[PDB]
């Protein structure tokens, strides 16, 4: 299962 | 930036027997950047139907790829892998040794 | 045995040639099971192992949604890293991300990973405590301070300790015959004189799974580390792995050498001699 990734550097 | 030259291995899936179906593999690993061109050569000429694995990478972040094609070795035919990468001032050609 | 799940993603900017290419792949232990390629036509998470195909359509829709969101996020992160490092928009740059979890024999959480590399070097990585970050340089420290203040780490714990563990547990049961198998190496030796006084002995391990293996040559019971030629473990292409180790030996002295093979699939380590 993939994770949700939305955070920006 | 960091730039790492590929390690190259060319080999068959199984120990080679003339006349018996097999797969020819060129494994490139430990390289960076990921942009790379890999060709399998049969008597110096590029084999047309070569597949490759999906781009992945190791714990140190270096990339690896597997290029492969079905083939049937014979006594007369020579095989090689030709790796083209920015770290290589000319493409590296590694000949298939049946015992490597 | 312990098991792991990983996702490995690569974004490569190609200025003047469209948007960055995004590729992601999923692994359980040494077995790939999915992939996504932003350049491919389907724009879908696609199966790469037979046992994942039995996941229903909600799975493929949701996983596709997640990986496409990641591709968009890391596209923007490539642009931010460009600014943090004061780099021109002319060159091609690479953002890699890895995440996943390890579980023990009992299926319980051991470790979670959530980490990035920019242009092939560490950028920022979630530390073992799942509360703090290790930043590689001054540019990564900017991100680290931002993510500490926003508690990014805490907000990934539900995934790392829960969804990731649970998914890995499901895959290990659904792919039991593949993922829980242990194939020991088929071994043999080759012997080739290289002159009238020396000969190569090559010890071969073939057809083994998982990829972890140790091949060592000894001479009269003493490890021959500095003189062994040892190639990186390599995929056969059928889901098993291969490795060999060679030593150059004075001819007539072959009997002093032993190759020692350790693999999780061997009840006892092997000793091979020519």
How is this structure best described in words?
The complex is a heterotrimer of chains A (9), B (100) and C (274). Chain A contains no helices and no strands. In chain B, 0% of the residues lie in helices and 47% in strands. Chain B has strands at 7-12, 22-31, 37-42, 45-46, 51-52, 56-57, 63-71, 79-84, 92-95. In chain B, the strands form two sheets. In chain B, strands 1, 2, 5, 6 and 7 form a five-stranded antiparallel β-sheet that branches. A four-stranded antiparallel β-sheet of chain B has the order 4-3-8-9, with no helix packed on it. In chain B, a hairpin with a 2-residue loop joins strand 3 (37-42) and strand 4 (45-46). Chain B starts with 6 loop residues before the first strand and ends in a 5-residue tail after the last strand. By secondary structure, chain C is α+β, with helices and mostly antiparallel strands. Chain C folds into two domains: 1-181, Murine Class I Major Histocompatibility Complex, H2-DB, Chain A, domain 1; 182-274, Sandwich (Immunoglobulin-like), CATH 2.60.40. Chain C is 24% helix and 39% strand. In chain C, the strands form three sheets. Chain C has an eight-stranded antiparallel β-sheet with strand order 4-3-2-1-5-6-7-8, with helices on one face. In chain C, strands 9, 10, 13, 14 and 15 form a five-stranded antiparallel β-sheet that branches. Chain C has a four-stranded antiparallel β-sheet with strand order 12-11-16-17, with no helix packed on it. Chains in contact: A-C, B-C. Chains B and C meet through strand 1, strand 2, strand 6 and strand 7 of B and strand 1, strand 2, strand 3, strand 5 and strand 14 of C. The PDB classes it as immune system.
What is the gist of this entry?
Chain B: GO terms for molecular function: identical protein binding; MHC class II protein complex binding; peptide antigen binding; protein homodimerization activity; structural molecule activity. The complex is a heterotrimer of chains A (9), B (100) and C (274). In chain A, 0% of the residues lie in helices and 0% in strands.
């Amino acid at each position: 299962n993939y994770n949700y990734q939305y955070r920006l550097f | 930036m960091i730039q790492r030259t590929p390690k190259i291995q060319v080999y068959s899936r199984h120990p080679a027997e003339n006349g018996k179906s097999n797969f020819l593999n060129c494994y490139v690993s430990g390289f960076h950047p990921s942009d790379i061109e890999v060709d399998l050569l049969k008597n110096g000429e590029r084999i047309e139907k070569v597949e490759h694995s999906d781009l992945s990478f190791s714990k140190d972040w270096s990339f690896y790829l597997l290029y492969y094609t079905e083939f049937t070795p014979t006594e007369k035919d020579e095989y090689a892998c030709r790796v083209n990468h920015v770290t290589l001032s000319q493409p590296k050609i590694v000949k298939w040794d049946r015992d490597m | 045995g312990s098991h792991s799940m990983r996702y490995f993603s690569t974004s490569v900017s190609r200025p003047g040639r469209g948007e960055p290419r995004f590729i992601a792949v999923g692994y359980v232990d040494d077995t790939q099971f999915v992939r996504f390629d932003s350049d491919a036509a389907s724009q879908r998470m696609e199966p790469r192992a037979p046992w994942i195909e039995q996941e229903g359509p909600e799975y493929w829709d949701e996983e596709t949604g997640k990986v496409k969101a990641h591709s968009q996020t890391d596209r923007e992160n490539l642009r931010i890293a460009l600014r943090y490092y004061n780099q021109s928009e002319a060159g091609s740059h690479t953002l890699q991300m890895m995440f996943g979890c390890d579980v023990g024999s009992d299926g319980r959480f051991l470790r979670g990973y959530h980490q990035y590399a920019y242009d092939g070097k560490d950028y920022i990585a979630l530390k073992e405590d799942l509360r703090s970050w290790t930043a590689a340089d001054m540019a990564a420290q900017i991100t680290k301070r931002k993510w500490e203040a926003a508690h990014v780490a805490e907000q990934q714990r539900a995934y790392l300790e829960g969804t990731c563990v649970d998914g890995l547990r499901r895959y290990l049961e659904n792919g039991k015959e593949t993922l829980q198998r242990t194939d020991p190496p088929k071994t043999h030796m080759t012997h080739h004189p290289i002159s009238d006084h020396e000969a190569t002995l090559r010890c071969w391990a073939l057809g083994f799974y998982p990829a972890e293996i140790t091949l060592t040559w000894q001479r009269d019971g003493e490890d021959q580390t500095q003189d062994t030629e040892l190639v990186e473990t390599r995929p056969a292409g059928d889901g098993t792995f291969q490795k060999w180790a060679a030593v150059v030996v004075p001819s007539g002295e072959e009997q002093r050498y032993t190759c020692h093979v350790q693999h999780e699939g061997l009840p006892k380590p092997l000793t091979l001699r020519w």
